[PDB]
Amino acid sequence: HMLTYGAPFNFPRWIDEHAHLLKPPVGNRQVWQDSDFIVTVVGGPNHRTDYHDDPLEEFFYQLRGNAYLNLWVDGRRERADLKEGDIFLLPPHVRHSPQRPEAGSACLVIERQRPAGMLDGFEWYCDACGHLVHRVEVQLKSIVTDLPPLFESFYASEDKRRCPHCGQVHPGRAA
Amino acid sequence: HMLTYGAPFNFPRWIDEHAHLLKPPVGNRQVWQDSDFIVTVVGGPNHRTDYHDDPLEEFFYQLRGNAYLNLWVDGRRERADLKEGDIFLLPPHVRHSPQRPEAGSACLVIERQRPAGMLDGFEWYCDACGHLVHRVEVQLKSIVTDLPPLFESFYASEDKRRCPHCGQVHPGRAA
Ligand SMILES: N=C(C(=O)O)/C(=C\C=C/O)C(=O)O
Ligand SMILES: N=C(C(=O)O)/C(=C\C=C/O)C(=O)O
Ligand SMILES: [Fe+2]
Ligand SMILES: [Fe+2]
Ligand SMILES: [Fe+2]
Ligand SMILES: [Fe+2]
């Protein structure tokens, strides 16, 4: 039947043409709408303090510039570098916090639409003792409608930010 | 928990290092094993006469060289060009026959593991009248174990190759 997502098109020129969105305050841009594969380009700079718990895999291809992922691997904080040219496949539920220090960077990220009932988690961890400070689970439909208010409500709440283990109040927006 | 699929790694150098498999007789190479996202690099030259009917989406990013897809769109034969640098998202069930004339070409193709019961189709069409000549449906586990014998059994069988509409016997392996 129909090429529902349109014809093939030149990706570098698309990234060039959307450079103004691959920077603060927007930072990323989904390529196709209403598809099963969620295909996004993510730019920079953006730093962030949440860890994502994705119930499905995520594919990364760092096309331009460098970035890295703060991870929880086997109970310990680790870093996975996404150097320019690198590809990477993240297994389900590995906690990850992408850090994207460079302007002009661009990373292809491919994920799957989550089926009804399969929820995403977003988590913050205590800088002092490492315990989990706060988790929100969300039926994720769009990283535009369902996600910013989630982060904003954490920054706005000393209670949400308060470590249950040691009482230290997480800093909120910037580490 | 674990980085089950390993650390990030440089993709161009991987493609360089696997160049000897991105050519006849192998032609392609899956990047990671036992993952939900099936991530493959496909090289050339390869021409082929089957149309794939994939019950899920396929993502294409033609990294090196040029290729194209013969399609059935809205009842008519069409061609979608994959020029170097192009990306493309194919909707489910659009019949497609990839043609990869160039040596040294490389296309990133990402698909999903099909769940039990969701079958792939492989189809051949009559050059003369355009009617369907033969379809095989397969629970696809690997494009290495389940796929070559399927194609080989079509080439080996004048009966399978015989157009039901006009009686013309499809040529088999090479158009
Ligand atoms: N990989 C993510 C994600 O954490 O799901 C991302 C950007 C937005 C959507 O993927 C990023 O900055 O890499
Ligand atoms: N896109 C395919 C497919 O038809 O599923 C392919 C190679 C092998 C696996 O995808 C190709 O040559 O593009
Ligand atoms: Fe994520
Ligand atoms: Fe703490
Ligand atoms: Fe296919
Ligand atoms: Fe025919």
A101 and B CB contact within 8 Å? no
> Longest C-alpha distance within chain B, in Å?
59
Q: Which helix (H) or strand (E) holds B16?
A: helix B11-17
Residues in chain B within 8 Å Cβ distance of A57: 35-37
B167: left (phi over 0), alpha (psi -120 to 50) or beta: left
Would you say the CB of residue B94 lies under 6 angstroms from ligand 2?
A: no
If one counts every other C-beta atom within 10 angstroms of the C-beta of residue A56, the result is: 19
- CA B107-A106-A32 angle, 5° bins: 65
By residue count, chain B amounts to 175
Q: How far apart are CA B108 and CA B99, in angstroms?
A: 14
| Residue among B9, B58, B62, B63 at smallest CA distance from A88 | B9
Cis, peptide link before residue B25, omega less than 30° from 0: yes
Shortest distance between the Cα of A163 and any Cα of chain B, in A, equals: 22
Q: Which atom of ligand 1 is found nearest the CA of A107? A: 13
DSSP letter assigned to residue A17: H
**For A53, which residue in chain B has the nearest alpha carbon?**
B1
Q: Is A42 exposed, middle or buried (0-12, 13-18, 19+ CB in 10 A)?
A: buried
Residue B58 near residue B109 (C-beta atoms within 8 A) = yes
Sorted by sequence, the CB contacts under 8 Å of residue B144 that are 6+ apart come out as: none
Q: How far apart are CA B65 and CA B6, in angstroms?
A: 28
Q: Please check whether residue B90 is in contact with residue B68, taking contact to mean a CB–CB distance below 8 angstroms.
A: no
Q: Phi/psi class of residue B78: alpha, beta or left (left: φ > 0; alpha: ψ in -120 to 50)? A: beta
Q: List Cα–Cα distances, B132 to B76, B122, B165, B166, B175, in angstroms.
A: 13, 11, 8, 11, 15
Q: Do A2 and B73 touch (CB under 8 A)?
A: yes
- Work out the burial of residue A6: count CB atoms within 10 Å of its CB; fewer than 13 is exposed, 13-18 middle, 19 or more buried: exposed
What is the resolution in angstroms? Answer: 1.8
Paired residues of A25 in beta bridges = none
Contacts of A87 (CB under 8 A, 6+ apart): A59, A60, A61, A62, B8, B9, B11, B14, B31, B39
Secondary structure E strands in A74-165: 76-82, 86-90, 96-99, 106-112, 120-125, 132-138
Peptide bond into A45 cis (omega under 30): yes
What is the three-class DSSP state of B101?
coil
Nearest to B1 by CA among A129, A48, A68, A96: A96
Name the 3-class secondary structure at B151.
Answer: helix
Contact with chain B for residue A82, Cβ under 8 A: yes
Name the closest-CA residue to atom 7, ligand 2. B42
Is the peptide bond prior to A25 cis by the omega test (within 30 degrees of 0)? Answer: yes
Whether the ω angle into residue A148 lies within 30 degrees of 0, i.e. cis, is: no
3-class SS at A78? strand
Element (H, E) at B14: helix B11-17
Residue with tokens 């580490």: A175
Contacts of A75 (CB under 8 A, 6+ apart): none
Report residue B63 as tokens.
């990294």
B88/A2 CB distance under 8 A: no
Q: How far is CA A52 from CA A74, A121, A145, A151, B148, in A?
A: 16, 6, 16, 12, 40
Ligand whose nearest atom lies closest to the CA of A48: 1
How is residue A21 written in tokens? 């969105």
Beta strands at A37-42 and A28-30: parallel, antiparallel or unpaired: antiparallel
**Closest to B123 (Cα-Cα) out of B144, B97, B92:** B97
Domain coordinates of chain B in residue numbers? Answer: 10-175
Name the experiment that determined this structure: X-ray
Angle at B98 between CA B135 and CA B123, to 5 degrees: 5
Q: Which residues pair with B29 in a beta bridge?
A: B41
Which residues are CB-neighbours of B18 under 8 A, at least 6 positions away?
B29, B41
Task: For residue B107, say whether it is annotated as part of any ligand binding site.
Answer: no
